[PDB]
Amino acid sequence: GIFGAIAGFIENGWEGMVDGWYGFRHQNSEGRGQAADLKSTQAAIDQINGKLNRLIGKTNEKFHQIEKEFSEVEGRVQDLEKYVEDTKIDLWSYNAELLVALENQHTIDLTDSEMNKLFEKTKKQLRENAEDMGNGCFKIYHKCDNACIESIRNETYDHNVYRDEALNNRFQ
Amino acid sequence: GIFGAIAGFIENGWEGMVDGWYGFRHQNSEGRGQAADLKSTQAAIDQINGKLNRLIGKTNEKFHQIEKEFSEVEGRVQDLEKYVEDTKIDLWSYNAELLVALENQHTIDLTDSEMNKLFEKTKKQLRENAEDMGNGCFKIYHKCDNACIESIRNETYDHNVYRDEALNNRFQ
Amino acid sequence: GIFGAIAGFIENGWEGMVDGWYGFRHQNSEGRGQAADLKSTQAAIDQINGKLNRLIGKTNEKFHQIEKEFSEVEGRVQDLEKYVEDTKIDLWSYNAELLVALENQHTIDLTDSEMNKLFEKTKKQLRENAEDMGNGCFKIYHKCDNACIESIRNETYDHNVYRDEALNNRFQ
Amino acid sequence: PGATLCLGHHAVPNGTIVKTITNDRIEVTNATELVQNSSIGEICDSPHQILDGENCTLIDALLGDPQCDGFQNKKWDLFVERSKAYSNCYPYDVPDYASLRSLVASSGTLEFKNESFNWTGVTQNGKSSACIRRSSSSFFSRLNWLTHLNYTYPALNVTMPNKEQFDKLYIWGVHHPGTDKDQIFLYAQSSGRITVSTKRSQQAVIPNIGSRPRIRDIPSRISIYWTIVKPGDILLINSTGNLIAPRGYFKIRSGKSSIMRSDAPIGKCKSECITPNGSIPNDKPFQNVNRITYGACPRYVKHSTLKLATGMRNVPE
Amino acid sequence: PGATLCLGHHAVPNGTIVKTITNDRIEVTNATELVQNSSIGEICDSPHQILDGENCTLIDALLGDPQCDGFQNKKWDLFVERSKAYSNCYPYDVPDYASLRSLVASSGTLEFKNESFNWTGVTQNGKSSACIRRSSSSFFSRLNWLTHLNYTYPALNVTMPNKEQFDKLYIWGVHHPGTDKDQIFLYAQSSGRITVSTKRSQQAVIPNIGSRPRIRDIPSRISIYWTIVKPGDILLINSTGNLIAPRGYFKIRSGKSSIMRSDAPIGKCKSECITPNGSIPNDKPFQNVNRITYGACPRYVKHSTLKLATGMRNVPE
Amino acid sequence: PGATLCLGHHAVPNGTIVKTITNDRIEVTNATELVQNSSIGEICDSPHQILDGENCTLIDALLGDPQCDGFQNKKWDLFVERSKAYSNCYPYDVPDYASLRSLVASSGTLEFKNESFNWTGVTQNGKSSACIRRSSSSFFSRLNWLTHLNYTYPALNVTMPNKEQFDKLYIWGVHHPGTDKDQIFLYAQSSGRITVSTKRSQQAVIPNIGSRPRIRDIPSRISIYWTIVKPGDILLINSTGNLIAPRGYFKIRSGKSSIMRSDAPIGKCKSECITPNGSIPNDKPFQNVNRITYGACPRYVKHSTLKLATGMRNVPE
C-alpha cells in the first residue's frame, strides 16, 4: 500500500477477526483480548460499496443494432461494419481492464489509509503515556485494566489521569 | 479524505477564513487570532488550476461530418451511420463521467494532503515544546506572545529558545 | 508529491547517490558517509516495472482493415469511413495522453511515499533516542559510531542500549 | 507491568488474486467478477416478446411461404431466426436483402391489410408447383402473380391512396422468365416494363430473361422490391408485364423490435439480456459471451475475467 | 498559561455536490460545470460565414430553382437548410441524393462558369409551367432541356475539355416521360440513350417511361446525375434523346465547409461553435445540447451535468 | 557530540519533463517515450510475406495485364501497390472496384485453375493492340474475348459445376462497343444480353453502346464483374453477345492477407509492424507515424510525444 501500514509496518493480518476489518489487540494485567473498530471498518466498506453501486446493475439498453456475423463475402460496407464493431470492442476492452486495475490500486490504498488513520488516532489519544514500538503496537507505561483499554477504544480515554504514572515509568 | 485531516481529525472548517484555504488559529496571553498560510493555499490552488487548464478551452474543431438525424427509412448504411454515432457518444459519455469522478476523488485527496502537510510542518517546528491535542491543535508549553506565534507561521521559530521552559512545564 | 517528502520537507536530492534511489547520510564521531537503502529502492522500482510490463511490448495484431486515404470524391460511404477512423483516433489519442498524465501523477506520488515510508521506519526505530530536525534528518542524542549507524540501516538497532544516555542528553 | 496495545487488520486464509496498476498478481481478502462468462443456454421468453421463426426466415414469413402461414399478423420484440430455416416457394432474391430484413425486424410486426387493386384485364392468382400449400400448387400468400388473359396483356395503370395516419409498406416484385418463350407463355409479349412510384419515390425494373439453375424445377426467378407510402401520398403501379403484384400493405411501426440469429431454445424464465448463446444475467457491467446482444446487457469485452477487489490486501499469518 | 495553536482549513455556507469514485453525493467548497447545457437560441454569423438557404435546399440552389436565383455563385462556411424549404420547379429526384448534397456542401461554393456545347441539331431551352420564373414558364437555370428540331433528334456527340487547374463538377440528368406518346412528342423516337464519360469514368442511363403521380400537373420526372472531370481530362456526352444537358461546370473546392439543418435564426454575434439549436459557448469540454455540431465545439455527451470540484471537501461549523 | 542521520533520495543533473494531472511541465529523474515517431524508411520482408506490385495494381495482376504476367499464381501476406502503377491493356473499369480489390487482397492469392467451357459456336481469343504482349496484340490473360464466327453469334448456354471443397472466384465482364457499328462488327447483332447465375445469385448486364474518350486508341470499354460459386453450386452463363468470358477460377482463401499503398522500398530485415512510411518498431504502445498499419502495431495517436515517467521527481542540489 501507498501508506505503508497494511503489508507494511504491520507484519500480517488477523485471521481471527471475523467481526471487523480493523481493530485492537491488547495485553494487560487482566489478560489479552481482541476487539474490532466500527468507524474505520465502516469507512472502508462505505467507500467500496460506492464503487460497487457505480458498476453493479448499471447496464445499457440496446435493441436494433448492426449485424456482427457474416456468412458470405460482400465488400466495402461489410468491411466497415466489421471494423466499426472491432474498434468498439477494443475500446471497451481497454476501458474495462484499465478501470479494474485503477480501482484495485485505489481500493488497496484506501484500505491501507484507514488502517493508518486508526493508528494515528490511537497514538494521539495516548499523548505521552505510550510509545510506538514500530510494528503497529503501543507500549503503555501505566496500569491499564480492561476499563482503561475500553476507554481507548471508545475515545473516552483521558491521558491526564495516568500522565504522572506514565511519565515516571518512561523516564527511569 | 485519504489522509484523514479534512473531515478527519479536524472536526470542521472555518467559515470565517476568507483570505486563505489553510491557516492557523491561536490562543495566547495576548488574545486569539486567525491567519492564513500562503504556501499551502497556493499549492492546492496551483494543482487545481493545472486540472482546469487541461479541460477549459481545449475543444476540438470538426467541420464536415456524417448525418446524424434521418427522416425516412433507408437501410443498411443508415443503420451503420446511427450505430457509429451512438457508439461514439457512449464512449465519450463514459470518458466524461469517469474523468470527473476520478478528478474529484483526487481533488479531495490532494486538498486533504496539503492540510496534513501543514500540520506536520508545524509539529516538526515545535519539537519538544508542544504536544498534539489530537484535533489539529497544539498545546504549547511556554509563554508564546504574538511575536512568538508569528515566528511559527513564518518558519523562523527557534525551539531552542523556549526548550528549557517548555520541558519544565511538560514534566511536572 | 502528495506525501510531502520529495520536493517537500527534504530540500533536494543527492546527485552523488548512484547505487540507490533512497538512502541515509550520517554524521558521527568517525566521519560522515552515505549508504543506499535496498528495500525502499526495490519497492519503487518494482512498482514502476509493473507499469512498464503493462505498456511495453503489448501491441495488437490487425491485418485487413478499411481504407483510410482517398484520392477521389465518392460520397456517403467514404464520409462514414473517414468519420469512423477519425472518431477512433480521437478516442485513442484521449486514452493515451490521459493514461500518461494519470500514471505520471501516480508515479511521482508512489516514489514520494516510499521516501516517507523509510523516514517513518527510521523514526520508529530510534524511539526516544532521537528527535526530528524537520528536514528529513534526525538528531541522535548519544554516541553512535559506525557500527551503531549500520545497526539502524540494517534494522538491528536496539533503542534500549542507548536509552539512558540519550534521555539524559535530551533533557538538560 | 504496563500494557501493550496493538493495531491491526483482518485477513482470510482463502484470498483472491487481482490486477493492479503496479502489479498484475496481488492477493486481496475478497473480489467480485465483473465479466459475465456464461449463459443459461436458453432464451427466456420474459420480459421481451419472443417470436420463434423455427423453419422460417423473417423474409419468408413476410412474403407468405406456405410453411410460414402461422406467422401472419404476428408481432414481436425479438424475432429469432434458426439456422435450419429454408425457403420452400418460388425461387426469389431480394436486392439489398439485409435492408428489408432490417426494416421489417425493427418494425416488429407482420400486420397486413388486404386491398383491392384494379387488375381488370389480367389473370390473377398465378401459382406454381415449387410453392406447395395443402398438397396443391400455390404461391406467396402476400403476392399476386399476374399473367395474360385471352392471350393479351393490357398495360396496367392502378392507383392506391394512403388515407391512413401511418406509413404503408408494399412488397412487390418482378418475374424473370427462364426463356424468351416463357416470357410469351406468361405475358403475351417480350418486353415487360414496371414503374412503381409515389410523390416521393420512383422505381423502375426491367425483366432479365435467361436461364438460372433450377430450384424445385424452376429456372425462373423473382426479384422482390419494396415501397413506402406516406400519409397523403399515393401508390401508382404502371406495368406491361412480369409484375408480381402486392395484395395489400404492412403496417410499419417503430419501437424496440429487432432480430437475432440463434439456435438456443426458448425457455420459461425472465432475463433482460439475450444473446445468441441464450440469456445472461446483467448484474455485471461486462461480458464475453457474445458481441450480439438484445436488451439491458453488459457490454461485450474480450477479457475472460476482470476481478474487482472488494477488500484490502490479504496478509495471512 | 502557555498557548494553543490550531491548524485548520476554510469552509463555506453554500457548498456544491459532486460525484466521486467512492461517493456519488459529496459536498465541496466550489465546483465548475463541465457540460454546456444551453444555447443562445440563434446562430452567430461570426466567425463562420453563414449562408441562410431560407426557402431553398442546397440542391435546389445548385440546379437553379427560380426562387433560389439569389444563391448563384454564393460561397459559405456553413449552409443552413430550413425545414420550411420546398421545391418549386420540374419534379426531380437524385439517385444518391445525400452524396451530392454532401459533396456540394463540403466544397462550399456554387461558383458556376457557362460553357458553349455544340447542341447543333436540337431545340435548346426547354421550359415548363411547373417551373415559373417571373410569371412565365421556365426551367432550372443550370440545366438545358433539349428537344427535337424539325421533328428529328440527331444523335449528339459533344466534347468539353478540362484545361483548367481544378476539377469540374458537371450536373446533368435524364428526362422520364410519363407516356410513350410524350417520348415521341419531345424527342421524336421511343428509345433515348445517354452515355456521359471521361478517361476515368463512364455513366449510362436509359429513360424509364411510365406514369408517376402529378406534381404541379407533371407526371414526368427528371433524374439528376453528376460527373467530375479532372485537369487534362475531357467530358464526352453521347446521347440520342431525353438528355437534360449541362450549361457549364461548378468549381469544386475543398475546405472547412459543410451544411446543417436548423430553424434557429441568424444573429449578429461571435461564437466558434454552432448547433442546430443555435450557437453555444465552447469554454467547457462537454455539452448535451446537440450531437450535430460545427466548429470548435465541446464534445457531445448524454449527461445533463458533470461538476468538476474546484475546492476541498466542505465541512461547515 | 551525538550524531546526525539524514534520510534522502537520489537526483540527476539531466532530468526529463513530463505531463501530469496537475502540472503539464514537471521534471523527473527518467522517462520513456511511449509514442513511436520514426520508421526505418523501408518495409522489412520478414516475418510477413511481401509481394511488390511494382508497376502493377492488384486488379491488373488479377485480370492478366501483360506487364503483370510474373504475378500469376503468387501468394502474399501484404501486397504493396506503388503509386507509379499504371494499366496497359484494354480500357476497363470495375463497378465497386474497391470491393473486388479488398476481397482479392484479403484472400491473399492469385492461384488460378484453367477450365474448359463449351464455347462451341464462337470465335475465342479476341485480341487488341491496346494490350500488347511480346510485341503483339493480345488481351487479359485470364479473360476470353468472344466474337462471332461465320458472321453469326449463337446464344450461349454453358455450365460449370463446383465439385471442389472451396469457393470459386470467377472474373468475367461485358464489352461496351463505342458505336452501333462496332456492335455489329463484333457480335453480329445490336442486342447483347448476359445472365451469370448460380443457385444463390443472379447477375444481368446489358451493354451500353456509346463513345468514351480513347485510351490507346480504343473508345470501347470493358466492365468487370465477379461471381462466387460455393461447393455443390453451379455456374451458369447464358449470353447472346458482348461477353468477356472467364478462362477459369481463382481460389478464394481466408487469412491474414491485405494490401497497402506505399512507395517505401523493401528491405532485408525483420519487423512485425508495417506502415506506408516503412516498418516501425512495436515496443511502444502508441505511434504517430501512420494511421495505416499492418501486423502487431502500436496504436495510432495524434500526439508527437507522450513521456511516461520512470523515476521520481528530480530535485537537484
Ligand SMILES: CC(=O)N[C@@H]1[C@@H](O)[C@H](O[C@@H]2O[C@H](CO)[C@H](O)[C@H](O[C@@H]3O[C@H](CO)[C@@H](O[C@@H]4O[C@H](CO[C@]5(C(=O)O)C[C@H](O)[C@@H](NC(C)=O)[C@H]([C@H](O)[C@H](O)CO)O5)[C@H](O)[C@H](O)[C@H]4O)[C@H](O)[C@H]3NC(C)=O)[C@H]2O)[C@@H](CO)O[C@H]1O
Ligand atoms: C387452344 C390452343 O391450342 N391454344 C394454344 C395453346 O396451346 C398455347 O399454350 C402454350 O402451349 C405451349 C406448347 O408447348 C406450352 O404447353 C405452354 O405451357 C407451358 O409449357 C411449359 C413446358 O411444359 C411449362 O414449363 C414447365 O413448367 C413446369 C412447372 O410449371 C408451372 C409451375 O411452376 O408449377 C405451372 C404454373 O401454372 C406456371 N405458372 C403460371 C402463372 O402460368 C409456371 C410457369 O409457367 C413457370 O414457372 C415459368 O418459369 O410453371 C416445370 O418447371 C417444367 O420443367 C417446365 O418445362 C410452362 O410452365 C407452361 N406455361 C404455362 C403458362 O402453363 C402453353 O401456355 C398458347 C400459347 O403458346 O397458344 C395457343 O394458341
Ligand SMILES: CC(=O)N[C@@H]1[C@@H](O)[C@H](O[C@@H]2O[C@H](CO)[C@H](O)[C@H](O[C@@H]3O[C@H](CO)[C@@H](O[C@@H]4O[C@H](CO[C@]5(C(=O)O)C[C@H](O)[C@@H](NC(C)=O)[C@H]([C@H](O)[C@H](O)CO)O5)[C@H](O)[C@H](O)[C@H]4O)[C@H](O)[C@H]3NC(C)=O)[C@H]2O)[C@@H](CO)O[C@H]1O
Ligand atoms: C403542323 C402540324 O399539324 N404538325 C403536327 C403537330 O400538331 C404535332 O404536335 C403535337 O400534337 C399533339 C396533338 O395532341 C400534342 O398537342 C403535342 O403537344 C403536347 O400536348 C400534350 C397534351 O396537351 C401536352 O401535355 C400537357 O402538358 C401540360 C404542361 O405542358 C408543358 C409544361 O410542362 O408546362 C409545356 C412545355 O412546353 C413542355 N416542354 C417541352 C420541352 O416541350 C412540357 C412537356 O411536354 C411535358 O412536361 C412532358 O411531360 O409540358 C400539362 O402537364 C398537361 O397535363 C399535359 O397533358 C404536351 O406537353 C405537349 N407537348 C409539347 C412538346 O408541347 C404536339 O407536340 C406533331 C407531333 O405529334 O405532329 C405534327 O405533324
Ligand SMILES: CC(=O)N[C@@H]1[C@@H](O)[C@H](O[C@@H]2O[C@H](CO)[C@H](O)[C@H](O[C@@H]3O[C@H](CO)[C@@H](O[C@@H]4O[C@H](CO[C@]5(C(=O)O)C[C@H](O)[C@@H](NC(C)=O)[C@H]([C@H](O)[C@H](O)CO)O5)[C@H](O)[C@H](O)[C@H]4O)[C@H](O)[C@H]3NC(C)=O)[C@H]2O)[C@@H](CO)O[C@H]1O
Ligand atoms: C468477304 C467480305 O467482304 N466480307 C465482309 C467484311 O468485309 C466485313 O468486315 C468488316 O468490314 C468493315 C468495313 O469497314 C470493317 O473493316 C470491319 O473491321 C473493323 O474496322 C474498324 C475500322 O478500321 C476497326 O476499328 C478500328 O480498330 C482499331 C484497333 O483495332 C482492334 C484493336 O483493338 O487492336 C483490332 C482487334 O482485332 C479488334 N478485336 C476483335 C475481337 O475483333 C478490336 C475491336 O474491333 C475494337 O477494339 C472494338 O472497339 O480492334 C483502332 O481502334 C481504330 O481507331 C478503329 O477505327 C474495327 O476494329 C474492325 N473490326 C474488327 C472486328 O476487326 C470488318 O469487320 C463484314 C462485316 O461487316 O461483312 C462481310 O460481308
Ligand SMILES: *[C@@H]1O[C@H](CO)[C@@H](O[C@@H]2O[C@H](CO)[C@@H](O[C@@H]3O[C@H](CO[C@H]4O[C@H](CO)[C@@H](O)[C@H](O)[C@@H]4O)[C@@H](O)[C@H](O[C@H]4O[C@H](CO)[C@@H](O)[C@H](O)[C@@H]4O)[C@@H]3O)[C@H](O)[C@H]2NC(C)=O)[C@H](O)[C@H]1NC(C)=O
Ligand atoms: C442451359 O443449360 C442447362 C444445363 O443444366 C439447362 O438446364 C437443364 O435442363 C434440363 C432439361 O432440359 C434439366 O433436366 C431435368 O432435370 C431433372 C433431373 O432428374 C434426374 O436427375 C437428377 C440428378 O441429375 C436426379 O436427382 C433425379 O432423381 C432424376 O434422376 C428431371 O426431373 C427432368 O426430367 C426428367 O424426368 C422427365 C419425366 O420423366 C423425363 O422426360 C426426363 O428425360 C428426365 O428423366 C430433366 O431431366 C436439368 O436439370 C437442367 N439443369 C439445370 C442446372 O438447370 C438449361 O435448360 C439450358 N437452357 C435452356 C434455355 O435450355
Ligand SMILES: *[C@@H]1O[C@H](CO)[C@@H](O[C@@H]2O[C@H](CO)[C@@H](O[C@@H]3O[C@H](CO[C@H]4O[C@H](CO)[C@@H](O)[C@H](O)[C@@H]4O)[C@@H](O)[C@H](O[C@H]4O[C@H](CO)[C@@H](O)[C@H](O)[C@@H]4O)[C@@H]3O)[C@H](O)[C@H]2NC(C)=O)[C@H](O)[C@H]1NC(C)=O
Ligand atoms: C401505363 O398504363 C398505360 C395505360 O393505362 C399505358 O399506356 C397505354 O399503352 C400503349 C402505348 O404504346 C397504348 O396502346 C397502343 O395503341 C396503339 C393503337 O392505337 C389504337 O387506338 C387508336 C385511337 O385512334 C386507333 O386509331 C388505332 O387503330 C388503335 O386501335 C398502338 O401503338 C398499339 O396497339 C397495337 O395493338 C392494337 C390492338 O391489337 C392494334 O390494332 C394496333 O395496330 C397495334 O398493333 C398499343 O397497344 C395505349 O393507348 C396507352 N394508353 C394511354 C392512355 O396512353 C402505359 O404504357 C403504361 N406504362 C407502363 C410503363 O407500363
Ligand SMILES: *[C@@H]1O[C@H](CO)[C@@H](O[C@@H]2O[C@H](CO)[C@@H](O[C@@H]3O[C@H](CO[C@H]4O[C@H](CO)[C@@H](O)[C@H](O)[C@@H]4O)[C@@H](O)[C@H](O[C@H]4O[C@H](CO)[C@@H](O)[C@H](O)[C@@H]4O)[C@@H]3O)[C@H](O)[C@H]2NC(C)=O)[C@H](O)[C@H]1NC(C)=O
Ligand atoms: C394512370 O392513372 C392516374 C390516376 O390518377 C392518371 O393520373 C390522373 O390523370 C388525370 C387526367 O387524366 C388527372 O386529372 C387532372 O387533375 C386535375 C384535378 O383538379 C381538380 O381536382 C382536384 C382534386 O382532385 C382539385 O384540387 C382541383 O382544384 C380541381 O378541382 C385537373 O386540373 C385536370 O383537368 C381539370 O381541368 C381541366 C380544364 O378545366 C378539365 O378539362 C378537366 O376535366 C379537369 O376539370 C385533370 O382533371 C389526375 O390528377 C391524375 N392523377 C394523378 C395521381 O396523377 C394517369 O394519367 C394514368 N396514366 C395514363 C397514361 O393516363
Ligand SMILES: *[C@@H]1O[C@H](CO)[C@@H](O[C@@H]2O[C@H](CO)[C@@H](O[C@@H]3O[C@H](CO[C@H]4O[C@H](CO)[C@@H](O)[C@H](O)[C@@H]4O)[C@@H](O)[C@H](O[C@H]4O[C@H](CO)[C@@H](O)[C@H](O)[C@@H]4O)[C@@H]3O)[C@H](O)[C@H]2NC(C)=O)[C@H](O)[C@H]1NC(C)=O
Ligand atoms: C453518339 O453520336 C454518334 C453521332 O455523333 C451516333 O452515331 C450515329 O448514329 C446512327 C447509328 O445507328 C447512325 O445513323 C444511322 O444511319 C443509317 C443510314 O445510313 C445513312 O448513310 C448511308 C451512308 O452510305 C446511306 O447509304 C444511307 O442511305 C443513309 O443515308 C441508318 O441506320 C439510320 O438512318 C435512318 O434514317 C435515315 C434518314 O431518314 C433513313 O434514310 C434511313 O433509311 C434510316 O431509316 C441511322 O440514322 C449514324 O451514322 C451514326 N454516326 C456514326 C459516325 O457512327 C451514336 O449512336 C451516338 N451514341 C449514343 C449512345 O447516343
Ligand SMILES: *[C@@H]1O[C@H](CO)[C@@H](O[C@@H]2O[C@H](CO)[C@@H](O[C@@H]3O[C@H](CO[C@H]4O[C@H](CO)[C@@H](O)[C@H](O)[C@@H]4O)[C@@H](O)[C@H](O[C@H]4O[C@H](CO)[C@@H](O)[C@H](O)[C@@H]4O)[C@@H]3O)[C@H](O)[C@H]2NC(C)=O)[C@H](O)[C@H]1NC(C)=O
Ligand atoms: C465523338 O466525338 C469525339 C471527339 O473527340 C470522337 O473521338 C475522336 O475521333 C477521332 C477520329 O474520328 C480521333 O482522332 C484520332 O486521333 C489520333 C490523333 O493523333 C494525332 O493528334 C494527337 C494530338 O491530338 C497527337 O498526340 C498524335 O501524335 C497525332 O499527331 C490519330 O492517331 C488518329 O488518326 C491519325 O492518323 C491516321 C493515320 O495516319 C490519319 O488517317 C488521321 O488523319 C490522323 O492523322 C485520329 O486522328 C480522336 O482522337 C477522337 N477523340 C477522342 C477524345 O476520342 C468520336 O469518334 C465521336 N464519336 C463518333 C461515333 O464518331
Ligand SMILES: *[C@@H]1O[C@H](CO)[C@@H](O[C@@H]2O[C@H](CO)[C@@H](O[C@@H]3O[C@H](CO[C@H]4O[C@H](CO)[C@@H](O)[C@H](O)[C@@H]4O)[C@@H](O)[C@H](O[C@H]4O[C@H](CO)[C@@H](O)[C@H](O)[C@@H]4O)[C@@H]3O)[C@H](O)[C@H]2NC(C)=O)[C@H](O)[C@H]1NC(C)=O
Ligand atoms: C441462353 O441460351 C439459350 C440457348 O442455349 C437461348 O435460347 C435460344 O435463343 C433463341 C430465342 O429467341 C432461339 O432461337 C430463335 O429461333 C427462332 C426460329 O425457330 C427455328 O426453329 C423452329 C423449330 O420449329 C423452326 O420452325 C424455324 O423455322 C427456325 O428454324 C427465331 O425466333 C430466331 O431464329 C432467327 O434466325 C433463324 C436462322 O437464321 C431464321 O431462320 C429465323 O427466321 C429467325 O430470323 C431465333 O434465333 C432458340 O431456339 C433458343 N433456344 C431455346 C432452347 O430456347 C437463350 O436466349 C439464352 N439466353 C440469354 C439471356 O442469352
